[PDB]
């Protein structure tokens, strides 16, 4: 259900104001 754009944001080394995913990452996306 996670958009590819959200997956890209979780893969990035940073978030940006206005673009933080509202829903926390599942464990698979935490390093």
């Amino acid at each position: 259900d996670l958009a590819e754009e959200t997956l890209k944001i979780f893969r990035a080394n940073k978030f940006e104001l206005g673009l933080v995913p509202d829903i926390p990452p599942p464990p698979a996306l935490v390093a």
């Binding site: 990035a12 978030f15 104001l17 206005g18 995913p21 390093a31």
Partner: protein, 296 residues
Amino acid sequence: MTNFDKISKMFWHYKDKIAQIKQDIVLPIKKADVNVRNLLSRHKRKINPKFGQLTNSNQQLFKIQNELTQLINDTKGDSLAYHWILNFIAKAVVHQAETEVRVKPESALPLGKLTLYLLVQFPELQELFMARLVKKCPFVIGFTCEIDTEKGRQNMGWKRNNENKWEDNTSYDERMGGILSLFAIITRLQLPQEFITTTSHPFPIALSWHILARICNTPLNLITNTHFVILGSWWDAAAVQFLQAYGNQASKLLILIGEELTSRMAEKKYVGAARLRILLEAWQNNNMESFPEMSP
């Protein structure tokens, strides 16, 4: 990204619930019989001192949990009295966050533990408590509106000093920080062993993610010192455990609030922003603090 229409809809849901609490519970009790009002007065003031008797001691925590549960159970048969007392408890817990946690932030730890326990033992309390938190402190769900108009001030939980003078900024900010401190604690505590296999945590760590994300997604023209205050109160209460929960993703979000958000508002010289940057710096220097563990 955040959909601010849904957060606004969520805000006005809890605001409508506060209004529903007044009509469907408070006035019924005002129009009610005397012998029951006396019993609830005896119960109302037998309950209020318990929250202040909390200490840093787990043994003392368990005592207060037990004594409040017996008093709430005294009303369990009687729906109007039961919901009236839970509304009172929810108000008293928030009031404690506004007053005692404000002066002694670490006191949010025992109070959060007590509240989380009451929230699963008596789950009608969850909606009453969350409605009271959102009404008094809309930051708990990431709601922000302009406070230039009188209506906006009211929505964001400001009180009146008198006729047409708002409460001073320090009073409001310190109340918001104390309330959010308590909620922050609750989101990062684990359920006691008696519930953890049987019950979902009613206000889990995801709700702390929502707060930070939604504030970071809020139009910057609506950010005020209070956002930074509650984020610093949140940090002192839960940053260690937030990192445990979400690791590198938590870290990106802490950097976003502590470096980027403070930088973007730097010319406002918000006192809360300066403190949040100090907390970021302590973490960057491998010196992040947490409230001391409770003693035996």
